[PDB]
Design a protein around this ligand. Structure first.
Ligand SMILES: COC1=C(OC)C(=O)C(CC=C(C)C)=C(C)C1=O
Lengths: 188, 134
């Protein structure tokens, strides 16, 4: 009746199984990335639309920044493993993009330190094997639903997301629309 | 038409190309899309309807429709987003052809080894291209 392929989402041609219950790539570099999460607080909203215990999941991606591109991912890696994503999410964002203060692994290092992370325990799970592994998992989910750019969502490793099949003048609305779309798609 | 566009096309076709490689290798996605609103309109506008024969100059008038039509907003959007971002957009580094037109990004993006001017010249090579022919 009113929920269309090609419109509000675009179906995935080569479906990948073993996926999350909803992935969400992004970079600490793409303003649109920033906007999406800092200017609209989208994930939070969408989390609230999701059913009982549907793993909202998120990753970070490489291509933009190259050398730092990487570091950042393993920066994140940790932050998935420890717990921390929530507490480093913003600082780092602000760090790289807005405040223009991040440059080296150490600059990042410290930005964990400050948010309640122990300068060893970070380096003590930086090199760990359960964060070299997570780092792959990221590149590998990304090469697997054929990412070209960022932001970008994906449900059940089976339906990409499409913001253009929605309003793009009313922010309050674009939101309420976007979230529904993911809910509807979580049971399909 | 032929030469005035082929003299000014090449000099911009190449002012891109010439220095594409001499400008080291800057990162760019809207470029190829924009270089396809060029080399898919000029390279098919000389050979469009002004053509090998010159009595049927309205097929170009329709290639000159879906020409810098895009060529405008492609660079117009491009520019807008540089200082004025959006949630709803993206930012990438990739090919694509929604019907297999593939070789187009395994050659003109492959054999590649400022917007200030683009934004305006794409609209400037439009109204001038529109007025005298429509
Ligand atoms: C017309 O489209 C465009 C170009 O062609 C003239 C560019 O050279 C460039 C810049 C060139 C490189 C190699 C990044 C951009 C960004 C572009 O959008």
């Amino acid at each position: 009746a009113q929920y269309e392929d090609g419109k509000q989402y675009t179906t995935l041609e080569k479906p990948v199984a073993g996926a999350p219950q909803v992935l969400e790539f992004f970079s600490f570099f793409c303003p649109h990335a920033y906007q999406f999460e800092e200017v609209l607080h989208i994930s939070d909203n969408v989390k609230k639309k999701l059913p009982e215990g549907v793993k909202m999941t998120k990753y970070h991606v490489n291509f933009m920044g190259g050398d730092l591109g990487k570091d950042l991912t393993q920066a994140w890696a940790v932050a998935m493993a420890l717990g921390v994503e929530d507490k480093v999410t913003v600082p780092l964002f602000e760090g790289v993009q807005k405040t223009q203060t991040i440059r080296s692994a150490s600059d990042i290092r410290d930005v964990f330190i400050n948010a309640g992370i122990k300068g060893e325990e970070y380096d003590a799970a930086w090199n760990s094997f359960v964060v070299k592994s997570l780092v792959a998992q990221q590149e590998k989910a990304a090469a697997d639903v054929q990412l070209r750019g960022v932001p970008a969502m994906f449900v059940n490793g089976k339906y990409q997301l499409n913001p253009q099949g929605m309003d793009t003048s009313n922010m309050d609305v674009f939101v309420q629309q976007y979230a529904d779309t993911v809910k509807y798609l979580s049971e399909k | 038409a032929w030469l005035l566009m082929a003299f000014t096309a090449l000099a911009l076709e190449l002012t891109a190309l010439w220095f594409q490689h001499v400008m080291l290798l800057k990162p760019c996605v809207l470029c190829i899309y924009e270089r396809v609103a060029l080399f898919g309109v000029l390279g098919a506008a000389l050979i469009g309807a002004i053509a090998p024969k010159t009595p049927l100059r309205y097929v170009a008038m329709v290639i000159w429709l879906y020409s810098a039509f895009r060529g405008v907003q492609l660079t117009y959007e491009h520019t807008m987003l540089q200082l004025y971002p959006s949630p709803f957009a993206t930012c990438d580094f990739m090919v694509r052809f929604p019907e297999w037109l593939p070789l187009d990004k395994w050659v003109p993006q492959v054999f590649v080894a400022m917007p200030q001017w683009l934004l305006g010249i794409f609209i400037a090579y439009l109204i001038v291209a529109v007025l005298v022919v429509i």
